[PDB]
Amino acid sequence: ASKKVCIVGSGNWGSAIAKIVGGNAAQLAQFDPRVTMWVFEEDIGGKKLTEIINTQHENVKYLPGHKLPPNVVAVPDVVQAAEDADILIFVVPHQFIGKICDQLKGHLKANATGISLIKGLKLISEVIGERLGIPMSVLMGANIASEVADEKFCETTIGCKDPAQGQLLKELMQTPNFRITVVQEVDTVEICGALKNVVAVGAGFCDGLGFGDNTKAAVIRLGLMEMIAFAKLFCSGPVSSATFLESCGVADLITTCYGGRNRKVAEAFARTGKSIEQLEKELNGQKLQGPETARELYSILQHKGLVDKFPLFMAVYKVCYEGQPVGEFIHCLQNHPEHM
Template sequence: MPAKKVCIVGSGNWGSAIAKIVGHNAKGSNRFDPIVNMWVFEEMIDGKKLTEIINTEHENVKYLPGHKLPKNVVAVPEITEAVKGASILIFVIPHQFIGRLCDQMKPHIAQGTIGISLIKGIDEGPEGLKLISDIIREKLEIEVSVLMGANIANEVADEKFCETTIGAKNEANGHVFKELLQTPNFRITVVQESDTVELCGALKNIVAVGAGFCDGLGFGDNTKAAVIRLGLMEMIAFTKLFCKGQVSSVTFLESCGVADLITTCYGGRNRKVAEAFAKTSKSIEELEAEMLNGQKLQGPQTSAEVFKILKKRDMISNGSHGRGGGPQRKRRTMNGHLERREQLKRLSLDSSLVGYMDANKCIEELLKQLEEERRNVRR
């Protein structure tokens, strides 16, 4: 059987950290082609092309400075050239660009190619929720798994221990990805509830924005803990309502669920920018440009998509809807620093992500399901 050629679609902070793992594992396995292509959106850095810097210095000096990439990771500026001959695709780009990129890739995708999405976001489709993995699956006509977990990119690149979750509807594909991606310090669990895993990765960014508001407003750790707990309950409620497949409560106890939520609410960029948003009169776009070195926030965009999905189903509570008409209007009306702080205080204290299920009822349901699942395991 010929070795499987891998292409990483994306080269930001997270994409470069994953490239470090994939390059090392591919080089040490007969199952994978040792040369790993990494598609890079071309940029000029101090007069030099970013792809040239990566291929000569073996470092992504813009998005993952201080970390050497394996020499077998090759930066390619043209997406059609990067995916040529690849049988494994790893998607790690901002979710708002995935549709257009897949359209460019489609004529160059070989039959039997499989993909895995590390993209944390969702989209709005004609029938409501549209998962990023579904967009890839439909546009490229390939099987797609997902990887989500408590994985801050710099810590993964530093080889600090962490866990992650692969959601794979095709179990064999899940184990191929596990072999490609697992290291002694990057431990992987494979589950079949791919949709649940993916929604956890997307929705936690909204909760992280709320946690950042708490920090920026000086609400304290007790309030922040309440926001995280309520956010988790509403993530579960949203997933159970919109997920087409099975939703098991135990999946939320994997790294993709509660662990990723905690990490993001304390160490992620959505939290950091939301804190600055609450403390200043600057817009999200200004803070993103100032603080993220070219990276994109997922929380505000995902929040806007969730709002549209819920509004379409007439599931926006009167309280939150009446105070602003959605994320876009709120952003336009928050002109003064003091006015913004007062609006954020009201928003943090009495609005909700989903607004249709009481969080205490949801946690009672979660505990009942966990107990039932434990009984089934004992049998």
């Protein structure tokens, strides 16, 4: 009764995660060696991507140059991929998860579990757990696919309520260069991923206004406190300050505020006066996560009269959407709740 794994997704992250999962699923006796990977079919040079993956063991489109363990089987039909699976690993861009869940509903093993790697503010893991009826875990941290594929050292956090399922997901994904901490707070692990991008816009505003590292450190820390307080006020699950010390909190926050794309655009916006829109295009055209999340935060907070409790988050919103001069951003932190 070794557990069967299906990787629902085969993009950049899915393919890199497949390198690890395939290896661990072969080596460890608690897992079935046959790992299916749902691959949305595509024509590459008049050839089928699933076919290329099953003959060359390389995702020539989304992770070229890397070999996948040969026990990882591309399957183009998502129902066929997942139907005998004990563990599903959801790793697709957020815009497709709905349709995927609408094709899988009613078709999963009765005992199937899920972990979401997908990073009105409802948690994507809840969208999946509700539509499919499976317990959901999450996998979040300061990490990127290219580096994980290159075995460059980094960590991630796993949020999973059940201890035995947590231990199993760790076994499945942990390597010497991809280190895992399991915690029981799914909602907390998961919400960090959206909030951190609001803070990084503020961090970039700090850079673009010409301030130094000690000011930027203050902006990030206050951002973190606002992330914790907001998660305690919004999330159903239990929420502890100590969970934000995991990779999903402080590490992802700092890697984003110091080297993120949201930060680069934010900086350029403050130094130049060019709009957020123009800078996204000039620096491919993919929109910024932070600003839209801040708008969504404003709606939630404004509807409960707490806009005042979150000056960083709200200052990000007002500069991005209500014409507040970016040069006021620091002023907005001079009477912060943390210092009352």
